[model samples]
Target chain A: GPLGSSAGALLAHAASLGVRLWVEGERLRFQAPPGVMTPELQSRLGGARHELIALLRQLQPSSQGGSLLAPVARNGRL
Target chain B: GPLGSSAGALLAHAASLGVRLWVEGERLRFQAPPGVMTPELQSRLGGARHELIALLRQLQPSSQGGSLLAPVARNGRL
Candidate 1:
């Protein structure tokens, strides 16, 4: 649950937007955005929320070797 | 320049989407999303790119005491 805090913050934002986020294996999953993650949404997230956005970015498939998917703690922390 | 890699990665993705992102003082700034940051865009970013998203998340204003705004490295890396 230690790392879960940051991930949870991102999850909350997603939830606020009515988006669902969870982890399966090393992969992070969520719905097709109802709309793009807009600047307004980012603003709503407030300042210093980088950890969550960082986690989401790492979930992308384009990175080399998919290192980003290395298992997050079972509690869902990065 | 060490941390620039991750932030640059994100900037590149934003650029791909025709989104411009830069750092001003401690604040991370970006254009209004032409469209939300959609899953398709995430897919294009690929896996293990979380650092970028994390940085973006930390930039929010909702965090306690605005700790997120602690000045990023002057090179635009967070």
Candidate 2:
């Protein structure tokens, strides 16, 4: 779906983070390491963990940013 | 406790960026600009080309009633 692609690409571009999209079983998976987070990973990464959680949170429909999701041709309603 | 550190370290912070950690027999690397990244030649990121990506969608949950947080804490447990 373009939604996932757009989100992944946006996050990667903004964070200076590179993203690898793949599938684990029936679920979508994306991986990013500190190296990819741009503007330099703060000396204290502990501060960013929640953003990661929130990113993950937004990945789901019940999250605050869920409105960003859009249905695509095959990715279904997600 | 390498459990968190140990397990995470195995993931090898991916994408382009600098990391300076002593390791043996692994090809840990960071790539910046058009050319950089190397197999060994450990120099603690002495040089590189770089650009930064802007990330604005990050979630920053906090006390909404104008309560100032002292930048929070490392182990504050959210």
Candidate 3:
């Protein structure tokens, strides 16, 4: 199957294992889907999930700037 | 503007903030845009990309045989 970032792939694995997924402009907007998806998948998603979110939060301008709209997309494409 | 994998590049800081992009056959069909692109975009697109298009690209009973189909489109969305 296609893999994304070690994180996105983790999400995909979750989806396969049937874990719901969500994202809001870089903020992983929702909790992982309800289910035991899998340890491997959980490991992958867990490993990068927090760090990535923290990184994105840091990257987000401390003060919102409406002048330029932030890039947006679901699976990374824009 | 948006960002992609940091492992993506450094000197290429001139890298487009939001512009041209690419990806390919990722076993990600019907999933994300370009088969869940990102570094997975190139790497997976690297070896597995081919694998997704047609396992082994060999006489191994074609899982879902297709073209080398290389990568295409932006968006890690592939």
Candidate 4:
């Protein structure tokens, strides 16, 4: 939904961290090279995740506008 | 530890999404403008979160190397 679009805007950031983030089923998903699930690794991701949520919570509906909007359908159904 | 750094690396990406992510205690946290908590917003974040985890899971210890290493201290205690 809106959150997914919001998260989608972070693709460049995810790549810089050498990972790819996306949505699967009803949850967020990511991909890396291999064997990156170390204790420290998790902590880092955890921190980033935390920050992301906080930022999301702060967004106001009025100013949000299309900022948090989901991708509109390209079909002729508007 | 390592995860935190991995997540940190994505800061730039998070900014692009107009949000910030960080770690608090044992869980991840985030912040936004304000009043951004919408069903769609959560869903979007959920998808991103899921994507991040999946990517982390794919990381292997061997190839991971320092890619997932946490920030090292600079104190002269070693």
Per-candidate TM-score, first chain only?
0.29, 0.25, 0.30, 0.32
Query: What is the lDDT for A59 in model 1?
Result: 48
Alpha-carbon TM-score of each model against the true structure: 0.29, 0.20, 0.22, 0.22
All candidates in order of lDDT, best leading: 1, 4, 3, 2
Lowest summed lDDT window (length 10), candidate 3 chain A: A26-35
Question: What shift in Å separates residue B50 of candidate 3 from its native position after superposition?
Answer: 52
Off by over 4 Å in 2: A1-30, A33-39, A42-49, A61-78, B1-78
Report how large a share of the reference interface contacts model 3 reproduces: 0.00
* Best of the candidates, TM-score: 1
The ten-residue window of minimal lDDT in model 3 chain B covers B26-35
DockQ-based ranking: 1, 4, 2, 3
Candidate DockQ scores, in order? 0.19, 0.04, 0.01, 0.09
RMSD of 3: 18.5
Candidates by TM-score, descending order: 1, 4, 3, 2
Q: Report how far off residue B22 is in candidate 1 (Å).
A: 9.0
lDDT of 2 by residue, A1-78 (tens): 355323444444434443333233533333444344332432222223334444454445555654664565657735
What lDDT score belongs to each candidate, Candidate 1 first? 0.50, 0.33, 0.36, 0.42
Q: Which ten residues in a row have the lowest lDDT in candidate 1 chain B?
A: B19-28
Superposed model 3: Cα runs more than 4 Å off: A4-30, A49-51, A54-63, A66-68, A71-78, B1-78
> What value does the lDDT take at residue A33 in candidate 3?
34
In model 2 chain B, which range of ten residues has the least summed lDDT? B50-59
